[PDB]
RNA sequence: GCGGGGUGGAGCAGCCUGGUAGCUCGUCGGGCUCAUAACCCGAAGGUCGUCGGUUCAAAUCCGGCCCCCGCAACCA
RNA sequence: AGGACCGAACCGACUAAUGUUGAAAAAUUAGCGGAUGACUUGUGGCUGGGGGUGAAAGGCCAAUCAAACCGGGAGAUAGCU
RNA sequence: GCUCGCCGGAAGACCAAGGGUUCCUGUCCAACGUUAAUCGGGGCAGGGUGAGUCGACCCCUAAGGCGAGGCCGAAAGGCGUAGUCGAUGGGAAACAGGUUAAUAUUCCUGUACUUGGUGUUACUGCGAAGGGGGGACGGAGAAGGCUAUGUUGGCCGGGCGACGGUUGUCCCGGUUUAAGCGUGUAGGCUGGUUUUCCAGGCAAAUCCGGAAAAUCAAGGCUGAGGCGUGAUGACGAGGCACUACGGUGCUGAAGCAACAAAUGCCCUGCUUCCAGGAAAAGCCUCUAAGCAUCAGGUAACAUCAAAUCGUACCCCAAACCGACACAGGUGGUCAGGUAGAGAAUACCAAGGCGCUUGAGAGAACUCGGGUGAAGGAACUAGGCAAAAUGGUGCCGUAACUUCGGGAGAAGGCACGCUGAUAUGUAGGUGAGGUCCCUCGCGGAUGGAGCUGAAAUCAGUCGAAGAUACCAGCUGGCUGCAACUGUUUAUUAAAAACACAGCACUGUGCAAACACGAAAGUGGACGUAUACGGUGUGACGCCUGCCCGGUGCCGGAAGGUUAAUU
RNA sequence: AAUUCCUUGUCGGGUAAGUUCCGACCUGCACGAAUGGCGUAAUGAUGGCCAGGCUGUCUCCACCCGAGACUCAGUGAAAUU
RNA sequence: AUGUUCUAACGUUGACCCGUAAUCCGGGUUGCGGACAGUGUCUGGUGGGUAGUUUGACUGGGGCGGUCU
């Protein structure tokens, strides 16, 4: 059966990538939180 | 002409077609075309604002001349064309200077007929004049509401206005709705009725024919649950409330006009 | 289980708010008509479901009984 | 010609049996319906939570829906076990 | 290695998306692998991806995103103009053969092509942020013409058979060749050409549009295939020599014709329909400011350049999405034989596999099948399940009907093979010859060969000829919904929802209405034959009484009544 | 009657026998005219009922072919307590 | 307090010019409306459109009936 995760690198990057995060105040707050937590990988960008 | 289809299938049994042999079979005049992509009834917030709009055939927009302000230069009708964007047919006209334009096709207009606009035009179907220059009692269409703005009234298939009176700066019009309205005498109008009066005799015949026209299904409020619509609910077919819109306003008689700015122009409401 | 009703021959008031029975039709007697119906004039006819209670006094107020209407009679 | 007919691909899901610590958190086998259309499908896009979207079943909105998920108010409150 | 079985519109091949070294070699077998493992998509080490032409990037835009200023909003922010991004779409150019363990349109061999720079020559009106053309567009249908492809003959090379027969009307194999460049064909479309004018194309224009005149009739455009060349080559059975016996080396015949034939191509065609079918650039042309012996344009030669990034491998799957080496899911392309209407089905080809526990036995019982005496729904909530029906041609066919239907109604009959008609017919295809021409890829004639139904008559075998696979059960009365469709992903597919039709009612355009503290946006580039709401639900015959209640609509004297004062 | 309690109403049909079905009747507990009335050809994986064929559905099971179960070697669970 | 008339506030989702290569916006000219419309504060009405909540106990189970000083 067709499951929920149907990968597309273009949609991944546009939805959740670094530039998408940077484009809004709330996205920049995500990055700030993740830096503060000390995450190795800030975003899905690869 | 109105033709009833033979019942060779249940979707055809009730179809009634309006077939006009005068209409151009070829492609439209390309310099007067532009794209018009569809909305689904969604505004710039992305939300549905008008329900029941979606799909149907792709359509090019034909630039129609509703202003008719190329005065003093005769034009000849080249051909009548189907316009997907409206009920009336349109006519491609060629002005003597070599310009082509589309106009709404009046009743009786055919290829080779000559038309003209301006103050000194003849009182003949398809000619456009200021209503100051048009006799009282005349039937007109494509009527301007403000001078120079372009025709806004009586543009649907088979429609027309009657000039009932002239009083100084204003003329009184009887509109198709039955309303009596004042309009400035400087406003232009085109003599005659809009053509294609058999438009209203068509019978679509089947559900899919409405889908082709981009109309999506209406679900009755009483078929819903209470959370969805005021009529929703009930064990079985129940109602027991005053009919309302989906947003709760009474929908059988309650008046909704509220425009004190334009009230002065309305001599008598449609009734 | 809970409301309601039993009043001249018929249908219906009067009950609450104790003392007092009305209305329309029917009945009977006289008229009018050749007669009948119509119509006119004059009358008679319910102690009020039954049984008790209460009261100076009960259609009336209270209770039983009988009869006739409703409604209710459910969830596993 | 046709929301025509019969029938593969394709889309679907009417019946039975199996399975039910499954081969599978919805399938398989045998039959079954549509199959030029209100059809089907790829790629991108848009609509956001009392909000969307709904040929309307309270359906669906990431195996979650009579109000998603995540984090916070937060050690809510619990005459109850 | 030999045999056997399985797939073959896939269980073969090639991709994209996704993944990321799983690719190839050596080595190891602890763990991983539902068993063992010397094996591996496992561990370790080394190797492997080569481009002017393929793809990205790049140029151009769609939906949409962002958005200078702007408009709006307590703030955060929202919306949007000029712009700028954004493919799933438009835009230059390469093919055949050979090669690695592992890449190849990338390497090599042969033969091509495209766009730009720069220079010498010869001419010469060039010039855009503007005008115009073009790009550039639907569904269905019907053919003709072709080709891929196959079949058979001929030709060439081999054979003459483990058991009766087999030098033939016999058996096996091969019979292949590109882009490009020349030709301009079947066919499609279109009158040319020259002058004069001119309220148009934001200004001009010689361009486009329009108008009036000559002149003449073939001008042009587009186009599959074929043919020629490319190619005296490449490839080629098979033989021969080595061998590291895995493979390398060497050589090399024939290389044709007829017929059949796509769902491909001509064809973005043509015919027809109504629901009326992207954009922008490249491209072609016109001029404005400007520039003018300068640039610039065009031609011909000559050179130079064409960067960067991807390129292994899987890819209907053990490599992706499903926690698994999971009976699930996953877009595009290729499309051999016989039988067949067929991409169904059966058996096969090329190609690929036997599904990573086996060995015995032959209990009950469970699962999936086969057959069944006599009966024949007696079973059961219910013919649930199974059984049965099934093809093609012909004959034949009821009520009722909206005249289409019902209808494949029902029911029936024929059917293999062999001969004859006719050593292969009707048909299709058509060589040579014979002629004709505005001599071509031309016409007419002509019929050689090739292919080939269908029927009748006569025989003949079997229990049975639609022999398998495949492939409707049928009729009668009745409720409900007109119909096709939609629905509770995962216990409900329905009588529910929708629907064409009907009606009521709002709405005069800055429409009502909806989303939005707003600006705006949808409605709609629509205008009352239009839009929105609500009920009803094809069609036929119809849809009676009640305005007291409760809503709504209208009125507006009187009473009552807010802030205010 | 997708509506009817009483109710398996009553009468007729069909069956040897019919609480279902079909046709009537009218006594409508509690039908009824766009929350439409009554018809209706065609349509339906729609509900009821009847027949022909056909049968392991059944009287009433029998036998066979395979995959398990059973024994052997290897690997090696689970709920529960 | 009505009625008219006016223009000069204010409106314009008329036309035309300009910024400007621009259907935004703004400025200009004009036309048409015009002290109306519309907005702010105050105020009456309406308001399941939406929100927060309430809807007793006893009871030979609960409901229903009855009760409660
Ligand atoms: Mg339209
Ligand atoms: Mg409708
Ligand atoms: Mg519902
Ligand atoms: Mg509500
Ligand atoms: Mg009901
Ligand atoms: Mg069909
Ligand atoms: Mg579905
Ligand atoms: Mg189901
Ligand atoms: Mg199946
Ligand atoms: Mg069908
Ligand atoms: Mg079918
Ligand atoms: Mg879910
Ligand atoms: Mg909530
Ligand atoms: Mg707190
Ligand atoms: Mg707690
Ligand atoms: Mg097959
Ligand atoms: Mg590895
Ligand atoms: Mg390997
Ligand atoms: Mg070992
Ligand atoms: Mg092991
Ligand atoms: Mg390995
Ligand atoms: Mg844009
Ligand atoms: Mg924006
Ligand atoms: Mg800004
Ligand atoms: Mg761009
Ligand atoms: Mg692309
Ligand atoms: Mg390889
Ligand atoms: Mg060929
Ligand atoms: Mg096809
Ligand atoms: Mg490769
Ligand atoms: Mg798998
Ligand atoms: Mg396996
Ligand atoms: Mg699929
Ligand atoms: Mg056995
Ligand atoms: Mg069995
Ligand atoms: Mg059998
Ligand atoms: Mg038997
Ligand atoms: Mg027998
Ligand atoms: Mg029985
Ligand atoms: Mg029995
Ligand atoms: Mg069955
Ligand atoms: Mg069967
Ligand atoms: Mg019935
Ligand atoms: Mg239906
Ligand atoms: Mg259906
Ligand atoms: Mg379900
Ligand atoms: Mg608007
Ligand atoms: Mg309905
Ligand atoms: Mg109905
Ligand atoms: Mg009953
Ligand atoms: Mg009987
Ligand atoms: Mg009956
Ligand atoms: Mg009813
Ligand atoms: Mg009525
Ligand atoms: Mg063991
Ligand atoms: Mg509430
Ligand atoms: Mg609270
Ligand atoms: Mg509560
Ligand atoms: Mg209690």
Curated annotation (Swiss-Prot), chain A:
One of its GO terms (cellular component) is cytosolic large ribosomal subunit. It comes from the Bacteria. GO terms for molecular function: structural constituent of ribosome. Coiled coil: none annotated. GO terms for biological process: cytoplasmic translation. Keywords: Ribonucleoprotein, Ribosomal protein. Part of the 50S ribosomal subunit. NCBIfam families: rpmH_bact. Belongs to the bacterial ribosomal protein bL34 family. This is Large ribosomal subunit protein bL34. It comes from Escherichia coli (strain K12). The gene is rpmH.
Curated annotation (Swiss-Prot), chain B:
GO terms for molecular function: RNA binding; rRNA binding; structural constituent of ribosome; transferase activity; zinc ion binding. SUPFAM superfamilies: Nucleic acid-binding proteins, Translation proteins SH3-like domain. Residues 38-47 have a biased composition (Low complexity). The modification N6-acetyllysine is found at residue 241. InterPro entries: NA-bd_OB-fold (IPR012340), Rib_uL2_dom2 (IPR014722), Ribosomal_uL2 (IPR002171), Ribosomal_uL2_bac/org-type (IPR005880), Ribosomal_uL2_C (IPR022669), Ribosomal_uL2_CS (IPR022671), Ribosomal_uL2_dom3 (IPR014726), Ribosomal_uL2_RNA-bd_dom (IPR022666). Keywords: Acetylation, Ribonucleoprotein, Ribosomal protein, RNA-binding, rRNA-binding. One of its GO terms (biological process) is negative regulation of DNA-templated DNA replication initiation. Part of the 50S ribosomal subunit. Forms a bridge to the 30S subunit in the 70S ribosome, contacting the 16S rRNA. Interacts weakly with S6 in one of the 3.5 A resolved structures. In pull-down experiments interacts with CedA. This is Large ribosomal subunit protein uL2. The gene is rplB.
């Amino acid at each position: 059966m067709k499951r929920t995760f149907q990968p597309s690198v273009l949609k991944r990057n546009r939805s959740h990538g670094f530039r998408a995060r940077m484009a809004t105040k709330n996205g920049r707050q995500v990055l700030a939180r993740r830096r503060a937590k000390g995450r190795a990988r800030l975003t899905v960008s690869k | 002409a109105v033709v009833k289809c033979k019942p060779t299938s249940p979707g055809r049994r009730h179809v009634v077609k309006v077939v006009n042999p005068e209409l151009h079979k070829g492609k439209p005049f390309a310099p007067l075309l532009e794209k018009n992509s569809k909305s689904g009834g969604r505004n710039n917030n992305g939300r549905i604002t008008t329900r029941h709009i979606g799909g149907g055939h792709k359509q090019a927009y034909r630039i129609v001349d509703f202003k008719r302000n190329k005065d003093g230069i005769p034009a000849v009708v080249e051909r009548l064309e189907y316009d997907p964007n409206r009920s009336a047919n349109i006519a491609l006209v060629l002005y003597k200077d070599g310009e082509r334009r589309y106009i709404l096709a009046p009743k009786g207009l055919k290829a080779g007929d000559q038309i003209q606009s301006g103050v000194d035009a003849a009182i003949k179907p398809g000619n456009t004049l200021p209503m100051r220059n048009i006799p009282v009692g005349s039937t007109v269409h494509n009527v301007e509401m403000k001078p120079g703005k372009g025709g806004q009234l009586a543009r649907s298939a088979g429609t027309y206005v009657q000039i009932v009176a002239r009083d100084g700066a204003y003329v009184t019009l009887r509109l198709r709705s039955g309303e009596m309205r004042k309009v400035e005498a400087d406003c232009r109008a085109t003599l005659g009725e809009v053509g294609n009066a058999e438009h209203m005799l068509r019978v679509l015949g089947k559900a899919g024919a409405a889908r082709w026209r981009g109309v999506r299904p209406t679900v009755r409020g009483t078929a819903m649950n209470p959370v969805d619509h005021p009529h929703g609910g009930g064990e079985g077919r129940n109602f027991g409330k005053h009919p309302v819109t989906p947003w709760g306003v009474q929908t059988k008689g309650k008046k909704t006009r509220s425009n004190k700015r334009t009230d002065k122009f309305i001599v008598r409401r449609r009734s």
